[PDB]
Amino acid sequence: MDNLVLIRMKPDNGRFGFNVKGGYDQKMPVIVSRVAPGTPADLCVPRLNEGDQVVLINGRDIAEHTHDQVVLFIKASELMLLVRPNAVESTV
Amino acid sequence: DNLVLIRMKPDENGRFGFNVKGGYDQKMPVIVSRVAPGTPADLCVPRLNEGDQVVLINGRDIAEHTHDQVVLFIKASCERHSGELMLLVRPNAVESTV
């Protein structure tokens, strides 16, 4: 789509501080389900927000990758995520 | 197997900030049904996630323990090593932490 947002993020343990649900095997988009306070995903600009939909992981189109394959791409990471922002909460 | 080991210190009121359902008497696995924002369960690393199934509590296998026994095990401060609750959980397959 248009108005995608590029989020950049450095790990803490190798951790970013966010949860994801979804994936091709779940027939659901990959959605950020929790961003924990004080973590890289919480403190980065632009912020990673819950309800944001992950579109690219380090340039890779993940639309047809499974939940567990998505998780492995993230941990195999800066982390570059291209997200479709949730409609309810916006960063400025 | 794909288990996750979690350790968690209680808040100032001795609470951890999650709900459990299930147990031997319910013929249902012990599952985390809610994890409240900003509670120890939400903020621990690895995080405790909703839908995670509890396998061990402070080293104890809870497979044949009742719901009320399981709750008692979580609340028992004298079974905690270094003031921490230990849980070994099977992560829910839908939500993952990174």
Distance (Å) from the C-alpha of residue A2 to the closest C-alpha of chain B?
Answer: 27
Interchain pair B47, A34: CB under 8 A: yes
Q: How many CB atoms lie within 10 A of CB A8?
A: 12
Burial of B12 (0-12, 13-18, 19+ CB in 10 A): exposed
* Best residue in A7, A15, A35, A81 for a mutation probing chain B (most B CBs within 10 Å): A15
Q: Which residues make Cβ contacts (< 8 Å) with residue A41, sequence separation at least 6?
A: A9, A16, A17, A18, A32, A35, A47, A48
Q: Report whether CATH 2.30.42.10 matches the domain B1-92.
A: yes
**Cα distances (angstroms) measured from residue A8 to each of A16, A22, A47:** 11, 21, 9
Report the alpha-carbon angle A87-B35-A69, nearest 5: 65
* Resolution value in angstroms: 1.9
The amino acid at B26: Q
Q: Are the C-beta atoms of residues A85 and A5 closer than 8 Å to each other? A: yes
Residue appearing with tokens 């230990």? B86
Distance (Å) from the C-alpha of residue A19 to the closest C-alpha of chain B?
Answer: 4
Interchain pair B95, A16: CB under 8 A: no
CA distance B39 to B97: 16
Domain definitions of chain B by residue range: 1-92
Please give the CATH superfamily to which domain A1-86 belongs: PDZ domain (2.30.42.10)
Which helix or strand (DSSP H or E) is residue B55 part of?
A: strand B53-57
